[PDB]
Design an enzyme around this catalytic site. Structure first.
Site, PDB file in Angstrom:
ATOM      1  N   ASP A 311       1.023  -1.465  -0.096  1.00 51.58           N
ATOM      2  CA  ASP A 311       0.008  -0.155   0.019  1.00 51.58           C
ATOM      3  C   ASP A 311       1.228   1.316  -0.274  1.00 51.58           C
ATOM      4  OD1 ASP A 311      -2.099   1.874   0.847  1.00 51.58           O
ATOM      5  OD2 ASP A 311      -3.270  -0.453   1.638  1.00 51.58           O
ATOM      6  N   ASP A 425      -6.469   2.619  -6.834  1.00 53.67           N
ATOM      7  CA  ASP A 425      -7.468   3.321  -5.548  1.00 53.67           C
ATOM      8  C   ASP A 425      -7.523   4.468  -6.257  1.00 53.67           C
ATOM      9  OD1 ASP A 425      -8.793   2.572  -3.795  1.00 53.67           O
ATOM     10  OD2 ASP A 425      -6.821   3.671  -2.035  1.00 53.67           O
ATOM     11  N   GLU A 428     -12.589   7.195  -7.988  1.00 51.09           N
ATOM     12  CA  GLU A 428     -14.110   7.545  -8.463  1.00 51.09           C
ATOM     13  C   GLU A 428     -14.407   8.773  -9.240  1.00 51.09           C
ATOM     14  OE1 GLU A 428     -13.555   3.972  -6.186  1.00 51.09           O
ATOM     15  OE2 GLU A 428     -12.767   6.371  -5.373  1.00 51.09           O
ATOM     16  N   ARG A 507     -10.340  -0.039  -7.911  1.00 52.05           N
ATOM     17  CA  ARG A 507     -11.497   0.665  -7.624  1.00 52.05           C
ATOM     18  C   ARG A 507     -12.688   0.511  -8.085  1.00 52.05           C
ATOM     19  NH1 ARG A 507     -11.223   3.762  -1.877  1.00 52.05           N
ATOM     20  NH2 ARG A 507     -12.127   5.427  -2.335  1.00 52.05           N
ATOM     21  N   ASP A 523     -13.738  -0.794   1.129  1.00 51.96           N
ATOM     22  CA  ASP A 523     -13.235  -1.165   2.570  1.00 51.96           C
ATOM     23  C   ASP A 523     -14.428  -1.938   3.377  1.00 51.96           C
ATOM     24  OD1 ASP A 523     -11.443   0.426   1.130  1.00 51.96           O
ATOM     25  OD2 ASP A 523     -12.157   2.293   1.783  1.00 51.96           O
ATOM     26  N   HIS A 581      -6.032  -8.060   2.043  1.00 56.60           N
ATOM     27  CA  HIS A 581      -5.952  -6.907   2.218  1.00 56.60           C
ATOM     28  C   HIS A 581      -6.390  -6.916   4.094  1.00 56.60           C
ATOM     29  CE1 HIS A 581      -4.340  -2.932   2.239  1.00 56.60           C
ATOM     30  NE2 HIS A 581      -5.156  -2.626   1.374  1.00 56.60           N
TER      31      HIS A 581
HETATM   32  C1  LIG Z   1      -9.755   3.559   4.467  1.00 54.04           C
HETATM   33 SI1  LIG Z   1      -8.307   4.113   5.217  1.00 54.04          SI
HETATM   34  C2  LIG Z   1      -8.076   3.248   6.066  1.00 54.04           C
HETATM   35  C3  LIG Z   1      -8.737   5.922   5.860  1.00 54.04           C
HETATM   36  C4  LIG Z   1      -7.542   4.343   3.580  1.00 54.04           C
HETATM   37  C5  LIG Z   1      -6.892   2.972   2.884  1.00 54.04           C
HETATM   38  C6  LIG Z   1      -6.721   2.602   1.234  1.00 54.04           C
HETATM   39  C7  LIG Z   1      -4.805   3.321   1.187  1.00 54.04           C
HETATM   40  O1  LIG Z   1      -4.835   2.970   0.189  1.00 54.04           O
HETATM   41  N1  LIG Z   1      -7.486   3.315   0.238  1.00 54.04           N
HETATM   42  C8  LIG Z   1      -8.612   2.937  -0.454  1.00 54.04           C
HETATM   43  C9  LIG Z   1      -8.463   1.877  -0.226  1.00 54.04           C
HETATM   44  O2  LIG Z   1      -9.785   1.173  -0.365  1.00 54.04           O
HETATM   45  C10 LIG Z   1      -7.562   0.846   0.797  1.00 54.04           C
HETATM   46  O3  LIG Z   1      -7.257  -0.520   0.176  1.00 54.04           O
HETATM   47  C11 LIG Z   1      -6.617   1.326   0.971  1.00 54.04           C
HETATM   48  O4  LIG Z   1      -5.976   0.139   1.943  1.00 54.04           O
END
Ligand SMILES: C[Si](C)(C)CC[C@]1(CO)NC[C@H](O)[C@@H](O)[C@@H]1O
Ligand SMILES: *[C@@H]1O[C@H](CO)[C@@H](O[C@@H]2O[C@H](CO)[C@@H](O[C@@H]3O[C@H](CO)[C@@H](O)[C@H](O[C@H]4O[C@H](CO)[C@@H](O)[C@H](O)[C@@H]4O)[C@@H]3O)[C@H](O)[C@H]2NC(C)=O)[C@H](O)[C@H]1NC(C)=O
Ligand SMILES: *[C@@H]1O[C@H](CO)[C@@H](O[C@@H]2O[C@H](CO)[C@@H](O[C@@H]3O[C@H](CO)[C@@H](O)[C@H](O)[C@@H]3O)[C@H](O)[C@H]2NC(C)=O)[C@H](O)[C@H]1NC(C)=O
Ligand SMILES: *[C@@H]1O[C@H](CO[C@@H]2O[C@@H](C)[C@@H](O)[C@@H](O)[C@@H]2O)[C@@H](O[C@@H]2O[C@H](CO)[C@@H](O)[C@H](O)[C@H]2NC(C)=O)[C@H](O)[C@H]1NC(C)=O
Ligand SMILES: *[C@@H]1O[C@H](CO[C@@H]2O[C@@H](C)[C@@H](O)[C@@H](O)[C@@H]2O)[C@@H](O[C@@H]2O[C@H](CO)[C@@H](O)[C@H](O)[C@H]2NC(C)=O)[C@H](O)[C@H]1NC(C)=O
Ligand SMILES: *[C@@H]1O[C@H](CO)[C@@H](O[C@@H]2O[C@H](CO)[C@@H](O)[C@H](O)[C@H]2NC(C)=O)[C@H](O)[C@H]1NC(C)=O
Ligand SMILES: [Cl-]
Ligand SMILES: [Cl-]
Ligand SMILES: [Cl-]
Length: 847
Positions: A311, A425, A428, A507, A523, A581
């Protein structure tokens, strides 16, 4: 005039809260619900468009549509052109456009009688599509007025049944609720929760018809939209721009509907073989030393791992195309070492580029600025938002120059660190602030006359300004393609950088994404609810031509439990894309981090998936060549059994493999639906409790202790298997085996597709081996469709035959008694040792 049954009332006030007087002044009916159903609805006489000058052409019809009374929306387009194209016997296509102005259109590449017939209502205007074979009305747009205003399109239809699936991305049952449901398509960064617009938009539905036929409808429209389902049953498309571009796919089989849809949007891409192995990632592998320990810990405990991921950890201050010189100083050596051991490497890429660094100090931004690659605002300057690195500009992946810049940044970074794909990632695109650092202007794009049911109640929420400029159009029109266009850009960049098949996991998605990339469901919480929900969602993406899909195994947000992670690994080993993940603040959830019994169950799940890889690879080949699904709902395979229609907590791999997972805490059994036929317990196939379920089409309670996931092989099918390895580099060198599930009449069929696992243009060049396996009259043979260097020299060492009623006296391979076989009278399993080649004609017989 106002005597309309409750379930058949179409909302005359979708735009605002309305009083009876205002409703009646619009020319609409006001009848309060008795306890949702609209209080203000269209009488049958409400002004629509009138059809005029209908004319016939070679390959279809054209007409003028005229509205004489304005709607309550601004900028009605009073004169429209209808074009009807009868494209194939399976595919009807019609557009409704403004003949005086080119409007925004989604960029997309393009006995004897059709399965459809088409008629038109003159006033009010409607398109009526019958199934020719049984006369069933599939589409009838006469049911409500046609609205066609600059920023509001509405087209409605009756549905043939209460059974409809599609309209991703939402956390929903596979079959959507027709109980006054508003489904919003506006790509949005939000943790999956019901009733919300999530990361992707797929304006496609498949509708079931009584008896088991089906059709599909694709609205080729990328604007923010609601789709409103009501119990009559009926559906209303409500879009905020573009045109009405409608495809109808006549099936009649649900599998044919999906194939016909994918004939328009694209057949799924063929992944590299290694892409089907286990992937392991978290936010918090904060050095090469910690990242290397993951592989060491997995290897020590005999857990397969094809692909190590990172990541944001690897980056310099969370910037794309950098690596920090603390924990990641020796990033290049780490990735080279992974490759020396036969593994691949993936890392996260964000779309947004740090804009705050000193001029000349950060090439991706500095070169992006030079070449004009970024989305711009009113004054022509880059729109600046906030994401991980701080202030960021947003690449415009509709700009051909941005595609060239992205290719260069990917190729140059790959010259430093030879990564094997891209995890894209936040596309959107996701913004930590509303619109931009400078907010957004006050205009009709930012503040439109109809705002769909988006979370936050604005198009700007968690993203960039709607009136921002891209090469092809405004972000207003292009927002839902942002992720797709990045996926196309990344696919091409990886082809040019590596010269083999790309591996892109995205995503955000749109219709046709599967032609370029896979998807993970984002998420998801580490909860029993999200485990259960991942099954309908993985099936939904397969129907939408994105077969390379999964959820974060053991869940992403929060802390998994050992029990949840056992059940999630068991089910997740049947995701076509299998990645564990984990979030930054979470307790560890790598397979090696659990108790001994939990490790054994997780190791068994990975062993079985690796044994099945040649089969899963063949299923992807069928997706890639014939528009087939990989993970499919029971109703796609047995549509004529109406009991299958609501099943979404079981899945098939292709036609033959039925998976019935435990999806609840504290369960030692599971009740699953078994279509008519014999289903063999895969536990009876040797891999390095009733043996057979004989179903009339019924629910069956199965033992499912913690160490078990129920997997059954359909009688009449043969599955190729391969021996074990901690990587596909190792496993692809092992001997193969067949699992032969006989019908009562002694028949079975299966196949194997084999190539080098990663080359481009394999099918075009013929660089593959294709073999059919046939069981008949106590014999097993192969039929050689194609045999080449790649696949010639695959060793067949074991043949397991299920449903052999009587112990044989002799088992022959090519006319000679075999070295060894066992028969189990209690399980009806005949296990045969052989020394054969997949690429050379053989005959195995018993009696
Ligand atoms: C939601 Si959070 C722990 C502040 C951020 C997570 C992350 C960080 O890159 N960005 C979004 C992706 O969907 C995740 O898989 C990713 O690990
Ligand atoms: C289009 O995008 C561009 C960026 O590509 C964007 O430029 C930004 O404009 C704002 C001004 O509207 C800038 O903000 C200024 O920054 C300077 C120096 O960093 C500050 O000193 C300025 O302070 C003045 O204004 C304040 C208002 O809060 C006063 O309180 C203060 O006393 C000063 O008078 C001011 O904040 C910003 O720097 C740029 N961004 C960049 C990266 O250059 C432009 O606004 C966008 N256009 C639209 C219409 O959205
Ligand atoms: C497609 O949908 C349209 C609109 O819903 C259907 O047309 C409507 O059909 C209803 C019921 O058949 C009609 O009401 C009936 O009118 C007749 C004629 O006077 C009367 O005898 C009945 O008692 C009843 O009142 C209605 O007029 C008609 N609406 C419109 C706008 O034409 C149509 O049937 C559907 N088409 C198909 C093939 O399903
Ligand atoms: C419906 O079409 C008529 C006729 O259009 C003519 O024939 C068509 C096949 C096409 O070739 C057109 O170019 C022709 O004009 C339209 O009625 C005509 O309107 C035009 C322009 O106002 C006028 O010059 C003619 O006198 C009209 N001809 C007749 C026979 O009435 C009519 O406007 C079209 N309706 C709509 C709603 O567009
Ligand atoms: C996920 O769990 C962490 C850690 O929980 C603690 O450590 C585990 C080994 C286990 O023994 C748990 O029962 C422990 O409570 C949570 O982070 C902790 O949160 C508390 C309360 O917010 C905080 O005061 C502690 O200092 C944190 N401890 C550590 C080591 O980080 C976290 O809240 C959990 N996440 C969720 C969503 O519940
Ligand atoms: C890989 O496994 C090693 C060995 O289990 C882990 O290192 C241990 O971590 C514990 C914490 O649970 C420490 O108390 C010990 O000091 C460590 N043991 C040894 C032998 O060094 C390590 O954390 C694991 N690493 C990853 C990345 O999972
Ligand atoms: Cl360079
Ligand atoms: Cl445009
Ligand atoms: Cl039932």
């Amino acid at each position: 005039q106002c005597d309309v049954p409750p379930n058949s009332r179409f909302d005359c006030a979708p735009d605002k809260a309305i009083t009876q007087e205002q409703c009646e002044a619009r020319g609409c009916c006001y009848i309060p619900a008795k306890q949702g159903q609209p209080w203000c609805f269209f009488p049958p006489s409400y002004p629509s468009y009138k059809l005029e000058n209908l004319s016939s052409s070679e390959m279809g019809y054209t007409a003028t549509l005229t509205r004489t009374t304005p709607t309550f929306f601004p900028k009605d387009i009073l004169t429209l052109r209808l074009d009807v194209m009868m494209e194939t016997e399976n595919r009807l296509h019609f557009t409704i456009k403004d003949p005086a102005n080119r409007r925004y259109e989604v960029p997309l590449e393009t006995a004897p009688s059709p399965l459809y017939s088409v008629e038109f209502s003159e006033e009010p205007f409607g398109v009526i599509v019958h199934r020719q074979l049984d006369g069933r009305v599939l589409l009838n747009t006469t049911v409500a007025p046609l609205f066609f205003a600059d920023q509001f399109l509405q087209l409605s239809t009756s549905l043939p049944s209460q059974y409809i699936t599609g309209l991703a991305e939402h956390l929903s049952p596979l079959m959507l609720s027709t109980s006054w449901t508003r489904i919003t398509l506006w790509n949005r960064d939000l943790a999956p929760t019901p009733g919300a617009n999530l990361y992707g938009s797929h304006p496609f539905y498949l509708a079931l018809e009584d008896g088991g036929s089906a059709h599909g409808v694709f609205l080729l429209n990328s604007n923010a939209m609601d789709v409103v389902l009501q119990p009559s049953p009926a559906l209303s498309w409500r879009s905020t721009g573009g045109i009405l571009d409608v495809y109808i796919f006549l099936g009649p089989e649900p599998k044919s509907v999906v194939q016909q849809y994918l004939d328009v949007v694209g057949y799924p891409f063929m992944p590299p073989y290694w892409g089907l192995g286990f992937h392991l990632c978290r936010w918090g592998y904060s050095s090469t030393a910690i990242t290397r320990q993951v592989v060491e810990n997995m290897t020590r405990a005999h857990f397969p791992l094809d692909v190590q991921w990172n990541d944001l950890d690897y980056m310099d201050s969370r910037r794309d195309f950098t690596f920090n010189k603390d924990g990641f100083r020796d990033f290049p050596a780490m990735v080279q070492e992974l490759h020396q051991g036969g593994r691949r490497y993936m890392m996260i890429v964000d779309p947004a580029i740090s804009s705050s660094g000193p001029a000349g100090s950060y090439r991706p931004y500095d070169e992006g600025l030079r070449r004009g690659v970024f989305i711009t605002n009113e004054t022509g300057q880059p729109l600046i938002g906030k994401v991980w690195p701080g202030s960021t500009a947003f690449p415009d992946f509709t700009n051909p120059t941005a595609l060239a810049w992205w290719e260069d940044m990917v190729a140059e970074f790959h010259d430093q660190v030879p990564f094997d794909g891209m995890w894209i990632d936040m596309n959107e695109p996701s913004n930590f602030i509303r619109g931009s650092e400078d907010g957004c202007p006050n205009n009709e794009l930012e503040n439109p006359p109809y705002v769909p049911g988006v979370v936050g109640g604005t198009l700007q929420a968690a993203t960039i300004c709607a009136s921002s400029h891209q090469f092809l159009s405004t972000h207003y029109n292009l927002h839902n393609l942002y992720g797709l266009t990045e996926a196309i850009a990344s696919h091409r960049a990886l082809v040019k950088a590596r010269g083999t098949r790309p591996f892109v996991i995205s995503r955000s998605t749109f219709a046709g994404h599967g032609r370029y990339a896979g998807h993970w469901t984002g998420d998801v919480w580490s909860s029993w609810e999200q485990l259960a929900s991942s099954v309908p969602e993985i099936l939904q993406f397969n129907l939408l031509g994105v077969p390379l899909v999964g959820a974060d195994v053991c869940g992403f947000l929060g802390n998994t439990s050992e029990e949840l992670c056992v059940r999630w690994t068991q089910l997740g080993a049947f995701y076509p894309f299998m990645r564990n993940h984990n979030s930054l603040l979470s307790l560890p959830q790598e397979p090696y981090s659990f108790s001994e019994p939990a490790q054994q169950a997780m190791r068994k799940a990975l062993t079985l998936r690796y044994a099945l890889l040649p089969h899963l690879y063949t299923l992807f080949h069928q997706a890639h060549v014939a528009g087939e699904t990989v993970a499919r709902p029971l109703f796609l395979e047995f549509p004529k059994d109406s009991s299958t229609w609501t099943v979404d907590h079981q899945l098939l791999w292709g036609e033959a493999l039925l998976i019935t997972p435990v999806l609840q805490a504290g369960k030692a059994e599971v009740t699953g639906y078994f279509p008519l036929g014999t289903w063999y317990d895969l536990q009876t196939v040797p891999i390095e409790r009733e043996p057979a379920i004989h179903s009339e089409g019924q629910w069956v309670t199965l033992p499912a202790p913690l160490d078990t996931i129920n997997v059954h092989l359909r009688a009449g099918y043969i599955i190729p298997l391969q021996g074990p390895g901690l990587t596909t580099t190792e496993s692809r060198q092992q001997p193969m085996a067949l699992a032969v599930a006989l019908t009562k009449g002694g028949e079975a069929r299966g196949e194997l597709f084999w190539d080098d696992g990663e080359s481009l243009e394999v099918l075009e060049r013929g660089a593959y081996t294709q073999v059919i396996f046939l069981a008949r009259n106590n014999t097993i043979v192969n039929e050689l469709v194609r045999v080449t260097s790649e696949g010639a020299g695959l060793q067949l060492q074991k043949v397991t035959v299920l449903g052999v009623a009587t112990a044989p006296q002799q088992v022959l391979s090519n006319g000679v008694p075999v070295s060894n076989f066992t028969y189990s009278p209690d399980t009806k399993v005949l296990d045969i040792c052989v020394s054969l080649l997949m690429g050379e004609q053989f005959l195995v017989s018993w009696c």
